[PDB]
Amino acid sequence: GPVWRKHYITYRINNYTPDMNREDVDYAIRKAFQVWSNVTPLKFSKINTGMADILVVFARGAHGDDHAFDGKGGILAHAFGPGSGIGGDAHFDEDEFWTTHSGGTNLFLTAVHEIGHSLGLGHSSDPKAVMFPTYKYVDINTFRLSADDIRGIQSLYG
Numbered sequence: 001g002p003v004w005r006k007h008y009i010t011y012r013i014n015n016y017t018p019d020m021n022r023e024d025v026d027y028a029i030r031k032a033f034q035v036w037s038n039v040t041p042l043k044f045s046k047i048n049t050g051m052a053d054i055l056v057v058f059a060r061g062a063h064g065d066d067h068a069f070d071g072k073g074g075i076l077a078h079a080f081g082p083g084s085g086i087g088g089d090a091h092f093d094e095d096e097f098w099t100t101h102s103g104g105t106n107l108f109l110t111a112v113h114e115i116g117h118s119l120g121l122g123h124s125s126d127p128k129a130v131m132f133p134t135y136k137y138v139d140i141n142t143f144r145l146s147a148d149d150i151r152g153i154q155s156l157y158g
């Protein structure tokens with residue numbers, strides 16, 4: 001399916017979850033993009049105004065696309081594959097409790113998975129892969145993509 005056909009990609013944080021400090025939201029999303037630019041030719045930059053390639057949004061329940069959220073638990077987030085408009089956007093369910101650590105749902109780890117979809121990756125059947133479609137906390141300070149994530153992204157870029 002689709003990929004970004006350019007190397008400089010922008011993101012914008014539309015709004016901030018009250019679950020976290022603002023600077024911690026910024027850092028979690030920045031670190032999550034860095035996971036992917038570590039293993040591709042892509043470069044990611046945060047913009048504070050205008051149209052981004054990837055718009056990062058916190059929202060709950062029905063929020064203007066055809067992918068309504070479901071309250072606490074269940075669906076944690078979703079993202080759209082590369083393309084114009086909503087393409088690339090990553091939406092995080094505000095009914096979850098986002099954190100920097102092992103409590104609640106860790107924003108960084110979730111954003112790594114969603115940004116994988118924003119770049120064109122699907123799900124992996126390997127439980128070790130960040131693209132495996134079940135959230136599990138792992139220590140974020142030593143986090144690494146699996147071999148499967150690496151082969152997957154490198155099949156699309158680089």
Ligand SMILES: O=C(CN(CCO)S(=O)(=O)c1ccc(-c2ccccc2)cc1)NO
Nearest residue numbers: 074075076077078109110113130133134135
């Ligand atoms: O894949 C999904 C939707 N979800 C899976 C079932 O449809 S989910 O439950 O919201 C979800 C979202 C993220 C993760 C995830 C988060 C961090 C690391 C690994 C997986 C797993 C499930 N969105 O990307």
Ligand SMILES: [Ca+2]
Nearest residue numbers: 071073075093
């Ligand atoms: Ca939910």
Ligand SMILES: [Ca+2]
Nearest residue numbers: 053085086087
């Ligand atoms: Ca977009």
Ligand SMILES: [Ca+2]
Nearest residue numbers: 019094096097
């Ligand atoms: Ca919340």
Ligand SMILES: [Zn+2]
Nearest residue numbers: 063065067091
């Ligand atoms: Zn959505």
Ligand SMILES: [Zn+2]
Nearest residue numbers: 113117123133
């Ligand atoms: Zn997913």
